[PDB]
Amino acid sequence: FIVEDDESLGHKELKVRKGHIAKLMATEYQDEYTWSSLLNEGLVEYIDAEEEESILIAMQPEDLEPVDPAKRIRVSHHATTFTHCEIHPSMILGVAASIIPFPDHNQSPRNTYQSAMGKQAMGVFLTNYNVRMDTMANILYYPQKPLGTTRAMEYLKFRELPAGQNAIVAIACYSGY
Amino acid sequence: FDMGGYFIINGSEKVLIAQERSAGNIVQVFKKAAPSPISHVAEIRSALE
Amino acid sequence: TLSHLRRTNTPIGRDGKLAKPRQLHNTHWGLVCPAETPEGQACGLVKNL
């Protein structure tokens, strides 16, 4: 998101507003607005690694522009000269890593091992396994969407084609086995 | 749910992986270690894009 | 399948070499997934966007 005043209040605020998001959801429900129109109206801009050099980014779309002890804290905004902001920090994660519940709570090597192992998990790889004569296919009997789902799972379409089952785990030291 | 983006070659689905490289047409200055007589190379992988 | 479609390779040899390319620079933010990678001889070289 581009950040620019655009107004007389003086505080720096993003270019995208509730009206724009409403129109986006409206075209969602109808199927008009689209990512292309977002770009054309200049509410979202593409930045590469080299152009990242000379821009100050805001983390939270609202928090850094302008407490419960367990609640999330943030480095204060001593800069009033932000230029862009993240859409959402979760999008730094890739496809396999965004399956994970609470990667920030995980350790990072476990996040890596999961990102390797999820590729090896068992599930429905495609809905046409009856017709494809693949060299080697595995189809879980009863796939299951996890109880704990990341918001990116709907874009990854994991709930539609999940790979794994929900089991009642007991973190218990029962038989020594 | 098949996204596409692959080639069917001899019936086997093949995918090409993005290959990293240093960008062309950029001057890059690198120091060199003491054993090498060379010091302070500047490289540019010039090419007609 | 999605990870393979969105995978990136690096021409650097998988054999024992410097760990600097295998690390992630700070510029990988938002472009390369900080977690997803193979483990073993390819770790840090193969990158997933």
Binding site: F1, E13, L14, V16, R17, K18, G19, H20, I21, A22, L24, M25, E28, Y33, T34, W35, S36, L38, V44, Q60, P61, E62, D63, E65, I87, H88, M91, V95, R151, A152, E154, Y155, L156 | M3, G4, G5, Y6, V15, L16, A18 | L2, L5, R6, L49
Partner: peptide, 30 residues
């Protein structure tokens, strides 16, 4: 109203727009 500040919850609609047009294989397809 239409010009009110925006919420981190509602950014997810923008992300949905992204994955609606481009999808996940946009790089290879384009």
């Amino acid at each position: 109203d239409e010009s009110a500040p925006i919420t981190a919850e509602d950014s997810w609609a923008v992300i949905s727009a992204f994955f609606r047009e481009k999808g996940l294989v946009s790089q290879q397809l384009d």
